[PDB]
Amino acid sequence: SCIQFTRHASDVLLNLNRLRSRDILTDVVIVVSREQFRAHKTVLMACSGLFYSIFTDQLKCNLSVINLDPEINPEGFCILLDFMYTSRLNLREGNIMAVMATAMYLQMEHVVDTCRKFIKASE
Amino acid sequence: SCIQFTRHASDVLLNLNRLRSRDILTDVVIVVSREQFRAHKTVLMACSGLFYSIFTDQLKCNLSVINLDPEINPEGFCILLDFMYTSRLNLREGNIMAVMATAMYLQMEHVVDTCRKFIKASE
């Protein structure tokens, strides 16, 4: 018999992004080919199968720094981190391959799906 | 020129609630008249003007335990904590006064608004 507030989840995510932009309560640095990205472990876990596995590990959950595979493109990661905090994906002809490869590695199934569909349309 | 994934914010919140239910990466205990509630500081801040003010304070941001005012009803708090993590509010004739008082104290403006409207309809 609950009532539901339609905009609540969007408002929560908008506020989490405001905390990220002001570097408030960020508890991890993600290192991608020397580029550094500050974020909230819980948001990373909520969006990515890879971060979910990393931060549920009894040793890695306590790490303040995570180094990604050197094949990961920092721009691809940046676009995906922005998507995690906003639901918006800046998908362009010039970045689609790097974004799809990064989403496959991060295990972000819905992003992988739209990249596959956009690539299939261009062939 | 971004594309947007409609269900992303809801999926993030659903995953944050799964982390809460399994007590994963919770970093604060909220004490309400001896009852204890574990939660994520970032989610509390994203939903409440009161928690936003508390955890942006340079001393309180480091506290692992927060004690609420003794007038706060634990059931009212529990209903609001569930709403924070799900967008669903269990508003009933028997709890509406405690829920509204708790939402006013927590500074959750949309919850206060619906409580005022439901109370006005019953008079």
């Binding site: 609950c2 009532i3 539901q4 507030f5 339609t6 | 669903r88 509010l89 619906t114």
Partner: peptide, 4 residues
């Protein structure tokens, strides 16, 4: 607010 809606009936979910």
């Amino acid at each position: 607010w809606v009936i979910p």
